[PDB]
Amino acid sequence: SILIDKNTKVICQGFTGSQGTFHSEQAIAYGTKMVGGVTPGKGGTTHLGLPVFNTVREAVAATGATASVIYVPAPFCKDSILEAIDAGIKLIITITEGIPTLDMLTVKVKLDEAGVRMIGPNCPGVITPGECKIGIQPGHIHKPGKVGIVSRSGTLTYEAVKQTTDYGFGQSTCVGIGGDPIPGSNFIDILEMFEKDPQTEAIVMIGEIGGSAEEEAAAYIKEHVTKPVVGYIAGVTAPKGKRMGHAGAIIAGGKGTADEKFAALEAAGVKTVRSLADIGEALKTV
Amino acid sequence: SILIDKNTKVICQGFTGSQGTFHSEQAIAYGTKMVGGVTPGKGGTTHLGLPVFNTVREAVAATGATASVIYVPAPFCKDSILEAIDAGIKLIITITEGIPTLDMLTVKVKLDEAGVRMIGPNCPGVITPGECKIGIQPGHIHKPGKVGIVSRSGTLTYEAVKQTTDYGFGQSTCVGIGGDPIPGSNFIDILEMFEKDPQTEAIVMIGEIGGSAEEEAAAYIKEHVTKPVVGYIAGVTAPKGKRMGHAGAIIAGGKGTADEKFAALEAAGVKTVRSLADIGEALKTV
Amino acid sequence: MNLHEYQAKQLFARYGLPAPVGYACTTPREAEEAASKIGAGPWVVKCQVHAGGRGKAGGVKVVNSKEDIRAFAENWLGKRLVTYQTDANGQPVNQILVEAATDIAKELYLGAVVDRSSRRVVFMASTEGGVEIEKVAEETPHLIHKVALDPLTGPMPYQGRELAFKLGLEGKLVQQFTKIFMGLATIFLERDLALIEINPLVITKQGDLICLDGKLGADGNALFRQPDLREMRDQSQEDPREAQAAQWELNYVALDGNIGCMVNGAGLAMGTMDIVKLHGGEPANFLDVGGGATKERVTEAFKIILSDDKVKAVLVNIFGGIVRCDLIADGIIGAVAEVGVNVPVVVRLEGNNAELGAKKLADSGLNIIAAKGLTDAAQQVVAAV
Amino acid sequence: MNLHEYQAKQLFARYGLPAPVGYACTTPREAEEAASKIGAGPWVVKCQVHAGGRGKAGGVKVVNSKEDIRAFAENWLGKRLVTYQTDANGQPVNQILVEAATDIAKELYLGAVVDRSSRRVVFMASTEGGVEIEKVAEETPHLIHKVALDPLTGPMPYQGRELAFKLGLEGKLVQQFTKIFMGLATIFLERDLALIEINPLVITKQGDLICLDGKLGADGNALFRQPDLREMRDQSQEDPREAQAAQWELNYVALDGNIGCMVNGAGLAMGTMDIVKLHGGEPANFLDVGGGATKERVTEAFKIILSDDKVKAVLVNIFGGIVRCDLIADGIIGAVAEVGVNVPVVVRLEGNNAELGAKKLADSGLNIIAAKGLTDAAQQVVAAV
Ligand SMILES: CC(C)(COP(=O)(O)OP(=O)(O)OC[C@H]1O[C@@H](n2cnc3c(N)ncnc32)[C@H](O)[C@@H]1OP(=O)(O)O)[C@@H](O)C(=O)NCCC(=O)NCCS
Numbered sequence A, B: 001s002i003l004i005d006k007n008t009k010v011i012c013q014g015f016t017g018s019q020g021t022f023h024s025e026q027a028i029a030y031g032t033k034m035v036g037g038v039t040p041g042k043g044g045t046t047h048l049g050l051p052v053f054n055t056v057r058e059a060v061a062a063t064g065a066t067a068s069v070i071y072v073p074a075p076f077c078k079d080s081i082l083e084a085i086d087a088g089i090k091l092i093i094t095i096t097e098g099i100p101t102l103d104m105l106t107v108k109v110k111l112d113e114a115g116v117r118m119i120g121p122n123c124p125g126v127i128t129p130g131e132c133k134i135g136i137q138p139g140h141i142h143k144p145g146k147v148g149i150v151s152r153s154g155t156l157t158y159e160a161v162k163q164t165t166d167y168g169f170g171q172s173t174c175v176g177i178g179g180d181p182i183p184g185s186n187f188i189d190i191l192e193m194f195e196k197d198p199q200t201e202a203i204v205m206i207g208e209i210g211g212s213a214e215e216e217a218a219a220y221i222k223e224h225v226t227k228p229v230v231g232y233i234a235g236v237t238a239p240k241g242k243r244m245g246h247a248g249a250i251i252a253g254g255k256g257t258a259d260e261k262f263a264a265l266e267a268a269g270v271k272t273v274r275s276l277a278d279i280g281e282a283l284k285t286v
Numbered sequence C, D: 001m002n003l004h005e006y007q008a009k010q011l012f013a014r015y016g017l018p019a020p021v022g023y024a025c026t027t028p029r030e031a032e033e034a035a036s037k038i039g040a041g042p043w044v045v046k047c048q049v050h051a052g053g054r055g056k057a058g059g060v061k062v063v064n065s066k067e068d069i070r071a072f073a074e075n076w077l078g079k080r081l082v083t084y085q086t087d088a089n090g091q092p093v094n095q096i097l098v099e100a101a102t103d104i105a106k107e108l109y110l111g112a113v114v115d116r117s118s119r120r121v122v123f124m125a126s127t128e129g130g131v132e133i134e135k136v137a138e139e140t141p142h143l144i145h146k147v148a149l150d151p152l153t154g155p156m157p158y159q160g161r162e163l164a165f166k167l168g169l170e171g172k173l174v175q176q177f178t179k180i181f182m183g184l185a186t187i188f189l190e191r192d193l194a195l196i197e198i199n200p201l202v203i204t205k206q207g208d209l210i211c212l213d214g215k216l217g218a219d220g221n222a223l224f225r226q227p228d229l230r231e232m233r234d235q236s237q238e239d240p241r242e243a244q245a246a247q248w249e250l251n252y253v254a255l256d257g258n259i260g261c262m263v264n265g266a267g268l269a270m271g272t273m274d275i276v277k278l279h280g281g282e283p284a285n286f287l288d289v290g291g292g293a294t295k296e297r298v299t300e301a302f303k304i305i306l307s308d309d310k311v312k313a314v315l316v317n318i319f320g321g322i323v324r325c326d327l328i329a330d331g332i333i334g335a336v337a338e339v340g341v342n343v344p345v346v347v348r349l350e351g352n353n354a355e356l357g358a359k360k361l362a363d364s365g366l367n368i369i370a371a372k373g374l375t376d377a378a379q380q381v382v383a384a385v
């Protein structure tokens, strides 16, 4: 179990909006410790039974939450991400899709400098089966277990989740790092949290075309990851130089192809799988 | 014979360009007295055997021409029309198509205030069969005669020219006033030059949709035109609110339809013709 | 060239004129997210097509919930909207404008155009806001007040004030209106506009003037010096064939008839359409051949005219021009051949080698009828159908 | 989002960077009239398409007479140009850029992009001007120099100079280059660009730096705050279906295969395409269903996939999502009967009511094959062909 657990108190920024409301009920029902939410101008009211604040700082005082989930539209996301960093939230989970690459580039710098952690943006979220759910993922397909998963794709995660629930293994914690070009946490940051997690016996690492986060992690894995790692890369049949849905999913200047990633994952001795159908199968081999 | 004749000395602005060169040879060969031309930066050279000047003033001095034909692209036409007005040209013939409406609105005010005459823009020109030709029209279809013609359309003029050459009548002087919304000379200005022209026994007035120059001339004709007038209006089958080729050819706010123009020419007692085929025929009746 | 409502509103904003807060959206998600950016409801959702009478057609609505916004967007984006000013196809809706609702106290009319008659830019105001201005001008002409910009001085505040008083405004509304007059007058002269229409120019319950709708027309002849406006053109709102013709220096306008016309000359083109009508025919299009009637250009014209299936015959009428009549006849044949024209083509040539060319056409052994003169050619095509 | 060369050049001009004198033309007449507006010849004529390798395809030429310009324009406007970077259809040429010829002394390369790896905007310079930069980087990586904009301070002059000296420039060329680096770096940050490419950045025989070509990419995610750039988008350069899909919250990209795919999720969509490949199939397109798999949205997706005739079968694969599977199966059927889907449709549902839905599909009678799991569904479609 990494990042979150039964004890993590969470507030939601953009709490009174469509997605915010909906996915919060889902979290509340799953048992997640939503302690409240923020929507400027609606401070001093209740929504889904929790208190709503005008600013992230007032929320942090009144509740002492330490993580924030963001359901705020792209145009204002950078402001809200920085507001959280600045009210002392130590864990930020951003669902929002469409944040300008240049905004992330600046936000990333500030995250790292201020010691804050952010999963996202443009991601499903994070879940610790049985204890905590922050995100849009469907809670009933996971089961407390020993496999940890990091993925750039959300839906691909659900395939792997399902397989590992069926082969009976279960999951420690599932991390969706997002499909953007510059996320707040990449593979190596999450890989390393698993290596040090007792509850995690093996790791399922799911990636896709574009960028070099896979390759860089490969290199890291070889040298610092001891637990068994099974990886799958999506996008072998993808055309060059075209965004494939995800802003970060694009083969640019002939770099970041599905295959180079496989190749390099294998060099680091990772159990690659060519069909996402056999993810469960390969874990049986560990 | 109005506006020009065997004695009119002419300079051409834009003389060394494509259209300028070509249509000048045609005027030379027809015997128009082309005394020279202007093209900034090519002053002090000869082209088509005439002298080329840097400014309209230098030309007017060295030759004493009094009329200028303009073959200068729309973007610089206003400058060149105003320079000619300044160097004292008393007659300006502008072929150029595409001059911004607002430029003409200003140029018109200057023309009237400075007592200069301009036929155009966006027109075929002016011809006095046998004596003078300034424009693009084909000289060999006219013949010295007694019918004067004013037209917003150039090609329609050629039909009428042809008919009156065949029926033997011939033409005094043919005036293409142009297809723009705001021309430098309208119907009434040219109508009145004919009324006072001995060589002109009858008048062929050709218009089309849009504007109210026809109507206004009608009213004028009734009260001040004595000679016989045969008119034709093009555009009965034209849709509303669509430019029909000519910038000035458009029925706007339901005004300026082919029919109201016929109606009003008839009220002033004008021989209207519903088929441009029978223009000659109606002139036989005078 | 026409502009969209959202585009005119941006322009007004640039010159500091007042318009409601709004956002142009290209997806239902953008549309629904505009809600909260704007504020509390209700909101106005408007399809963005060049034509008017969008209201009537149900392309404009006031809604109360984000879902309703999404619903509207989903219903229209990608569809064509037909109003009484669009042809039978209507215009494609590719954007929804979502703006804040306005508390309307009174509706006025402000507009400007180039008055061909007086040779001036004329501004018109009326208290008859919300009505097609041509109705008002026919029924109650004394209800429309005008002023004309003096080209020597440019727009002056006394002109703005006069209209303001004739409309019976007083107080701060006189100032606001003067300022709007001054803005619009400026934009008009600066961006080479052809037409401006604020219908309605509203007086809000809170006492302010605001431009609820906006309709601008730019002088296409001036685009060479209006780089920003050039970029704002939306070809999707026009008959694609019109643009296609323009690339080939042809002026095309589709009509409903079955006799196609290819003529050189705007006037001769309109004349030809008329004489075909006179003799029972039904002109199917206006097409003026701008360039020299060269093989390639003539071929193209055929492709465009025939793109319409209602066409049953084609009348070509070419007088003079800068191409020898025998070369034209050559091109007409090569066109009929490369294009594969099924209908009968009647041709009227006139000028150098007209005699020689007509023979070439007749000997060709294609469905080409060389006519002997205008009226014959007219009767011939009418006949061929 | 991409921009045309002429649009990038305009942008440079606004920020004071140097480009040659030129005019973008839409008609051969405009093209030929550009001649004299530019000056004495010779001139460069360039087709304006988003793709590169326009030179090779013969879309760029140096000519000597006004006639030659007209000729080029006539030859290309309205045609599609195929370069090694365009698909087989090529992109439509609707404008010709006509600019003054440049006396080239030396050709350099200047460019910037967001380096995913270092999380910085990186600028790259090289003396290998006139060559595809990816060749240079693979063969001679030591000939490419880079600097990275510090988000804290913004572009600094020392970084401009650094590159200038590594390229071996000296004197006034060092100043000029620094100023150009500063300009581009600013444009980059201010207009939310994703990519900049000046290839070649030329040193003229007269000793000055000038941007001969220009290639800009803007970050689509930022258009909401780049109004001007929004307006500059030219949809004519893209597969129309891509935009069409976008209106319906679908991400479409056509490929060449005969098995269509409708999946929800970018990763799952790419995964599905791969597993179909693994089992001998040929994916015909990538389509990610963004919105809820509602009847209307599912219908739309079918229309788009099937717009391609190579399609012989369709694989639907929907995992979870915010719509109960039985409702999805319902929509899939309506879709099929209403769109009139001929090819066999294989469906893989998963989540709430997955089994109830698979029954609804099977009892429907239509040619819908409910698959029992990913691999089976894969084999099924591959088989259906
Ligand atoms: C963020 C997103 C979910 C928002 O959608 P939404 O819930 O419909 O947006 P809404 O307008 O309904 O609500 C947004 C709320 O944020 C609030 N808000 C805006 N800026 C804010 C800020 N800085 N701080 C706090 N709240 C803020 C708004 O006021 C609004 O709430 P309100 O309606 O009470 O005013 C949507 O933009 C999005 O990004 N979708 C893609 C999600 C995705 O697929 N992710 C990847 C998963 S793999």
Ligand SMILES: CC(C)(COP(=O)(O)OP(=O)(O)OC[C@H]1O[C@@H](n2cnc3c(N)ncnc32)[C@H](O)[C@@H]1OP(=O)(O)O)[C@@H](O)C(=O)NCCC(=O)NCCS
Residues within 6 Å of the ligand: B013, B014, B015, B016, B017, B018, B019, B020, B038, B039, B040, B070, B071, B072, B073, B074, B076, B079, B080, B095, B096, B097, B098, B122, B123, B124, B136, B153, B154, B155, D032, D033, D035, D036, D037, D066
């Ligand atoms: C005006 C028009 C004929 C010019 O076309 P063009 O001859 O091909 O243009 P060119 O560039 O070849 O020549 C224009 C010349 O004007 C010159 N010129 C520019 N500004 C000038 C000025 N202020 N004064 C004088 N000459 C000037 C240019 O230098 C050029 O000469 P150059 O080529 O030797 O440098 C054309 O733009 C036009 O309006 N055509 C339509 C005419 C028409 O069809 N009318 C309706 C008949 S019914």
